[PDB]
Design a protein around this ligand. Structure first.
Ligand code: GLC
Ligand code: CA
Ligand code: CA
Ligand code: CA
Ligand code: CA
Length: 920
């Protein structure tokens, strides 16, 4: 056997992949005579002083990739394949560093690279490891700790006292079949803090690292997640009174049940950070939801009574971007002096002069408003510094997937947060009458590598839980941060086990997957199958659409999830009604008007939108109101008969769903500009304040009165503004403010962050002061419009049919084709004899008319049909979106500008003719 030696001829990159027991995929070994897999247990492979590689190695022989490997890693199927002998001691090699080396016949090195072992790890240990349970599993009879670390050389369980002093370090017992380590002790360990002391090779640093890491299956933590804690979530001491009997206020069993879902996407701080009627110690906490006397809680109670059915919570799992040690945090309601003591950047800034002042941070920000402008964005200048050390962040930064966030609890030390979180869930369901959905972020981790404080998974099993670049081994960042690998068996299991805890132990009713398309379709479905065993009515849905992982596996996208029952946010109606797209900047923000802001019918001074383009948006909007079904048949802008899949959406088929319950419509969400800020960017100069409020309502009407599940951002009913901020994840209490005292909508409170919106300062300055800023009058008006819409949505089962086939049999549209009155959306829902059975004993049909235009419009296609205005809208009088609507003798219906009318055909002795869907 020749000896590999030197003639930059050392280990470089990591483009070799050990995908299974005997297969090694590596481009560098092609056509090369000598292909080997060198390995070193405790050392870094490298040529010795003599220039030779004298470390142990295994001989690799050319081969052809097998079907099994090709299916698992399609993106690597083209790589030159090499086989290892069947007697290779895989386990021992995986305990240290392995490097693939290739050299010419003469033995002169041609290339050497590191090896990515995720594949062989799954092939060798996954099945055995999947059959076990992980974490500190405490029962009243004892505890069993288990952690998966197939490559670690040593793992010790370190037990800490409450004061964080080591009271014991136990070497764990490794299971050869699974590669998991365990340790069994007595129940006296209940409540104890612990960490796993790892001795493991990390490919990134190429060294056998030695560090203590928290449990990835942690179910309790110390302040700021420094230590994991042994806990039995079943303990009655961790449950509010009557917890076990908590039931879901809204059904989610049938598709009809699901269709009634009306979501209010909220954030723990956005809800109570500014509410002075919420006890001070509960502001920005889970428990604020229990302050029945507060403006915020009373507001949500009324929304629920009016038709909002679900509260969706932005990250409430353990996020990493907020320091849980209160002494290290300063918020705007506190003295500027406090800010200076915890934030050295502020103390060294142009604002240092405020340090020894007697002002609070918010008082300073308030005074900076008058002289704030595009040329002097001082409000955001100060806020950007405040953001570094405040209590604010959306939290899409996973630290621990199965422990509640600590900063939202009154006491982040230990188990305390568990009961408070549950108390909140109970309050929402029991006292506010709404189901709860949790935003989950399994698509990435906050960090990876062997050094970052928040790198947990990548420290315990390096290069396994993260998705890596095929050539460099670098952790990918397409998600934003440290991309995870849901396609790997043990991470898929971690996800499913995690969801099981939130479902069973925290009684969560549904989960919204962040960037769900970075997950394999099969993995999402498998997780749903597992969770349905715990809660048969659990609902799964998600978003993303920037995919790019299709080369590795079939992704969980809108298209691929058709007919599966897994929901996806639809960006079709969203874009059509809001106008433009999320990538717009500068003038495009104003030019790209939407149906909700007058596309075509009320053009601003910059837009070039044609009537045809405006009508195309109307096609996308109507399709969306019908559940954005692939097979829904409608008449398009040109009078052509088209299926939803035939309506174009920027190059892709518009309609993609099988059932409306697989589609979540919306016109505002936590990310991107608020609906009001978009209307402010797009509205024509002549559109006055009152008109803009109606535009907000008309925009929301397309969602609320549609067949798809309805979703909306907390505060849309209050014309919520972020002062034009596009991405407010770290913009603090200032820009994310929601005022439940109803004084204003937080519009015009300073130019938004320059780093992300600086390119929009020009357009902002030009449109910002077009009209007055909303006040109590406008907020109360909008809340009334909003509650009317949600009340209408639940006023009849016809609005939420659930089944795609039923929608196709009952839903149709009028005012379509080339001779249509632009901006007028007229949707009919049949309940007559031709539709089948009467689902609503009070009506034979319903007509939804949304006049998104500055003209009054008259409908003549319902003449002699005895159409009547909804009792709900009649009851609202001149405060209704239907104020001014006229139902004449001849049967014609006239709608005022920017109005919404829900009309019905009263049912007589028997089911009537209704509004049959026309043959197309
Ligand atoms: O915290 C991770 C990410 O969260 C949200 O997606 C923010 O929009 C983004 O800016 C940030 O990088
Ligand atoms: Ca945290
Ligand atoms: Ca912050
Ligand atoms: Ca890729
Ligand atoms: Ca009926």
């Amino acid at each position: 056997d020749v000896v590999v030696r030197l003639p930059a001829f050392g280990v470089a990159l990591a483009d070799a992949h050990w995908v299974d027991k005997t297969t090694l995929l590596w481009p560098g070994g092609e056509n090369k005579p000598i292909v080997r897999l060198y390995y070193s247990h405790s050392s870094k492979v490298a040529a010795d002083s003599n220039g030779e590689f004298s470390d142990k190695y295994v001989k690799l022989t050319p081969t052809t990739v097998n079907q099994q490997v090709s299916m698992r890693f399609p993106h690597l199927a083209s790589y030159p394949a090499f086989k290892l002998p069947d007697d290779v001691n895989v386990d021992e090699l995986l305990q240290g560093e392995t490097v693939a080396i290739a050299a010419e016949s003469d033995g002169i090195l041609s290339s050497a690279t590191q090896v990515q072992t995720a594949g062989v790890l799954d092939d060798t240990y996954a099945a055995a490891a999947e059959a076990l349970s992980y974490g500190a599993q405490l029962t009243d009879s004892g505890v069993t700790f288990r952690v998966w670390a197939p490559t670690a050389q040593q793992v010790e369980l370190v037990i800490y006292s409450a004061d964080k002093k080591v009271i014991a370090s136990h070497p764990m017992t490794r299971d050869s079949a699974s590669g998991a380590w365990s340790w069994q002790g007595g129940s006296d360990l209940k409540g104890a803090f612990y960490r796993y002391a790892m001795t493991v090779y990390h490919p990134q640093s190429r060294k056998v690292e030695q560090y203590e890491v928290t449990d990835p299956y942690a179910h309790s933590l110390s302040t700021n997640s420094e230590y994991s804690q042994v806990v039995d979530l079943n303990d009655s001491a961790l449950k509010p009174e009557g917890w076990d009997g908590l039931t879901m206020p809204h059904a989610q069993k049938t598709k009809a049940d699901l269709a009634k879902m009306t979501i209010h996407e909220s954030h723990i701080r956005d809800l109570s950070a500014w509410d002075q009627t919420v006890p001070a110690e509960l502001r920005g906490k889970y428990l604020a939801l229990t302050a029945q006397e507060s403006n915020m809680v009373q507001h949500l109670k009324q929304l629920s009574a009016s038709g909002v059915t679900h509260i969706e919570l932005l990250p409430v799992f353990d996020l990493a971007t907020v320091n849980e040690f209160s002494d290290k945090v300063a918020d705007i309601q506190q003295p500027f002096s406090r800010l200076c003591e915890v934030n050295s950047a502020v103390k060294s800034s142009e604002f240092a002069g405020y340090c020894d002042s007697g002002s609070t941070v918010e008082e300073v920000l308030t005074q900076l408003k008058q002289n704030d402008s595009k040329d002097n964005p001082q409000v955001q200048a100060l806020n950007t510094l405040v953001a570094q050390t405040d209590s604010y962040n959306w939290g899409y930064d996973p630290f621990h997937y199965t422990v509640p966030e600590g900063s939202y609890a009154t006491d982040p030390e230990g188990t305390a947060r568990i009961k408070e979180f549950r108390t909140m869930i109970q309050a929402i369901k029991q006292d506010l009458g709404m189901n709860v959905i949790m935003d989950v972020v399994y698509n990435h981790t906050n960090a990876a590598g062997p050094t970052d404080r928040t790198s947990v998974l990548d420290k315990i099993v390096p290069w396994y839980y993260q998705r890596l670049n095929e050539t460099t081994g670098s952790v990918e960042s397409a998600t934003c941060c440290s991309d995870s690998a849901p396609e790997h068996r043990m991470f898929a299991k971690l996800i499913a086990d995690s969801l099981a805890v939130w479902t069973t132990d925290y009684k969560i009713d549904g989960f919204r997957f962040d960037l769900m398309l970075y997950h394999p379709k099969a993995q999402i479905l498998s997780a749903w199958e597992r969770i349905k065993a715990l809660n048969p009515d659990i609902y799964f849905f998600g978003e993303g659409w920037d995919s790019n992982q299709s080369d590795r596996f079939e992704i969980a996208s809108q298209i691929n999830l058709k007919g599966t029952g897994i929901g996806t946010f639809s960006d079709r109606l969203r874009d059509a009604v809001r106008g433009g797209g999320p990538f717009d900047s500068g003038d495009a923000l104003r030019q790209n008007q939407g149906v909700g802001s007058g596309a075509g019918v009320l053009p601003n001074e910059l837009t070039t939108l044609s009537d045809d383009q405006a009508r195309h948006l109307a096609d996308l909007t109507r399709l969306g109101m019908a559940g954005n079904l692939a097979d829904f048949v409608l008449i398009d802008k040109d009078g052509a008969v088209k299926r939803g899949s035939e309506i174009d959406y920027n190059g892709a088929p518009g309609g993609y769903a099988a059932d409306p319950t697989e589609v979540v419509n919306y016109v505002s969400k936590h990310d991107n500009q608020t609906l009001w800020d978009m209307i402010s960017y797009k509205a024509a100069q002549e559109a006055d304040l009152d008109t803009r409020v109606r535009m907000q309502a008309v925009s929301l009407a397309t969602v609320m009165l549609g067949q798809g599940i309805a979703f909306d951002q907390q505060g849309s009913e209050l014309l919520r503004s972020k002062s034009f901020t596009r991405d407010s994840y770290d913009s603090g209490d200032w820009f994310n403010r929601v005022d439940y005292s109803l004084q204003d909508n937080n519009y015009n409170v300073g130019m938004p962050r320059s780093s992300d919106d600086g390119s929009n300062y020009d357009i902002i300055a030009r449109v910002k002061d077009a009209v007055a800023t909303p006040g109590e009058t406008e907020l109360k008006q909008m809340t009334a419009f909003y509650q009317e819409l949600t009340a209408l949505r639940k006023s009849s089962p016809l609005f939420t049919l659930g089944d795609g086939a039923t929608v196709m049999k009952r839903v149709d549209f009028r005012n379509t084709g080339a001779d249509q009155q632009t901006g007028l959306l007229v949707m009919t829902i049949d309940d007559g004899m031709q539709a089948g059975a009467s689902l609503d004993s009070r009506v034979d049909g319903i007509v939804v008319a949304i006049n998104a235009a500055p003209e009054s419009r008259t409908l003549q296609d319902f003449a002699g049909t005895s159409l009547q205005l909804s009792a709900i809208q009649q009851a609202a009088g001149d405060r209704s979106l239907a104020s001014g609507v006229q139902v004449a003798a001849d049967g014609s219906v006239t709608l005022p500008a920017w109005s919404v009318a829900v009309l019905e055909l009263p049912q007589g002795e028997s089911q009537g003719a209704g509004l049959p869907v026309s043959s197309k």
